[PDB]
From a paper:
We obtained two crystal forms of Slx1–Slx4CCD3 from Thielavia terrestris (Tt-Slx1–Slx4CCD3, where CCD3 corresponds to a previously characterized Candida glabrata construct). Crystals of Tt-Slx1–Slx4CCD3 that were obtained in the presence of HJs were found to be crystals of protein alone. These apo crystals crystallized in the C 2 space group and diffracted X-rays to a resolution of 3.1 Å. The phases were determined using single-wavelength anomalous diffraction (SAD) for zinc ions at a wavelength of 1.2828 Å. The asymmetric unit contained two molecules. The overall structure of Tt-Slx1–Slx4CCD3 was very similar to Slx1–Slx4CCD3 from Candida glabrata, which was reported earlier. The main difference between them was the connection between the GIY-YIG and RING domains. This region formed a long α-helix in Cg-Slx1–Slx4CCD3, whereas it lacked a secondary structure and was partly disordered in Tt-Slx1–Slx4CCD3. In the apo structure, the region that comprised residues 88–113 was not visible in the electron density maps and was likely disordered.
Residue numbers in the entry:
A (entry chain C): 4 to 49, 54 to 88, 114 to 172, 197 to 266, 271 to 312
B (entry chain D): 844 to 925
Write the structure that this text describes.
């Protein structure tokens, strides 16, 4: 990869309001614009007969566009892995499937009916869904027009790294304790404000996993706070690759 | 899943996670690339696995890209064909 972890990339379930039985499964990093395209207001969409469309639900936090498409196709084709009942159930299984089980994902619902089917299915579910998988609702700006399309929800975090690593306050690693030189390997910074704990990238993975390759949840050694591996990487890749993206965020 | 892959997976895991970490942040190691959610080109990884990285961790022989793809999916590692 050569671009940082996108600020937002979703896989959405689209429904017609003309016909509640017509669903459509796509992906986008900008849900408001893509919904505007599905309803003919912005040029770019794929049949007005079913317009206007709505986004009843979406899954967020795909760490790469490739990943979001691997998921999108996997949900448009359950016969190789239709109705709201099956879409809800296929989504539930895919989130447990090993190929996606450890991804930094969040499930969003926007329609009390569709969210009701999700709870109806989870009540009969075979396996319980991983508790780190946040399932959040947002009914009736709201809905998809509340999701932050940019890197603003981590602006202070990014500024913290811009200080620690520009002025070489990285210190010593907080796992191996060996003093890390500047620009000497990938050095990942903790998320919680007030703490400047830094460590070698492969050391955090070793620490979070105490079998597996990809960390999910974990606690900080220095400050004791909790972090999600997706956020820590979204800052590391932002610093390593997205120098331009960082400048537009902090107005530098 | 298959009775023969499970042995090969323990080696593929080993070779990836024991490879030296990169000293240049711009050119990360394969293990570090997966840690940062990078899409992993199977041709590149499989070729790197057959460069001698499996003979290091004690697996004589060769691996197929399909077996490597099944490895990535068992570890939630995003991969794709070239
Ligand atoms: Zn270290
Ligand atoms: Zn901390």
């Amino acid at each position: 990869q050569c671009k940082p972890i996108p600020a937002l990339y979703t896989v959405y379930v689209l429904r017609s309001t003309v016909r509640h039985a017509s669903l459509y499964i796509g992906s986008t990093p900008n849900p408001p614009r893509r919904l505007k395209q599905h309803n003919g207001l912005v040029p770019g969409g794929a049949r007005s007969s079913l317009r206007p469309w709505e986004m009843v639900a979406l899954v967020s936090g795909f760490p790469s566009m490739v990943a979001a498409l691997k998921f999108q196709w996997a949900l448009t084709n359950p016969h190789l892995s239709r109705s709201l009942a099956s879409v809800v159930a296929n989504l539930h299984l895919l989130l447990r499937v090993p190929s996606f089980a450890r991804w930094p994902l969040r499930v969003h619902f926007f329609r009390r009916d569709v969210f009701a089917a999700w709870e109806k299915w989870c009540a009969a579910a075979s396996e319980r869904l991983r508790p780190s998988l946040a399932v959040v609702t947002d009914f009736e700006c709201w809905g998809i027009h509340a999701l932050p399309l940019d890197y603003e929800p981590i602006k202070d975090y990014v500024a913290k790294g811009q200080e620690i690593f520009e002025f070489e306050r990285q210190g010593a690693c907080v796992v191996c304790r060996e003093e890390m030189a500047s620009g000497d390997g990938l050095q990942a910074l903790c998320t919680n404000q007030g703490c400047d704990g830094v460590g070698h990238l492969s050391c955090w993975s070793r620490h979070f996993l105490k079998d597996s390759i990809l960390p999910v949840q974990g606690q900080c050694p220095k400050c004791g706070g909790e972090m999600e591996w997706g956020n820590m990487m979204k800052e590391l890749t932002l610093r390593t690759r997205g120098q331009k993206e960082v400048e537009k965020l902090l107005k530098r | 899943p298959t009775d023969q892959q499970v042995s090969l997976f323990r080696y593929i895991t080993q070779a990836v996670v024991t490879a030296p970490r990169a000293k240049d942040p711009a050119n990360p190691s394969w293990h570090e690339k997966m840690l940062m959610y990078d899409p992993i080109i199977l041709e590149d990884l499989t070729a790197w696995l057959n460069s001698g990285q499996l003979d290091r961790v004690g697996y004589d022989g060769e691996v197929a890209p399909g077996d490597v793809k099944k490895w990535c999916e068992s570890k939630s590692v995003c991969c794709l064909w070239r």
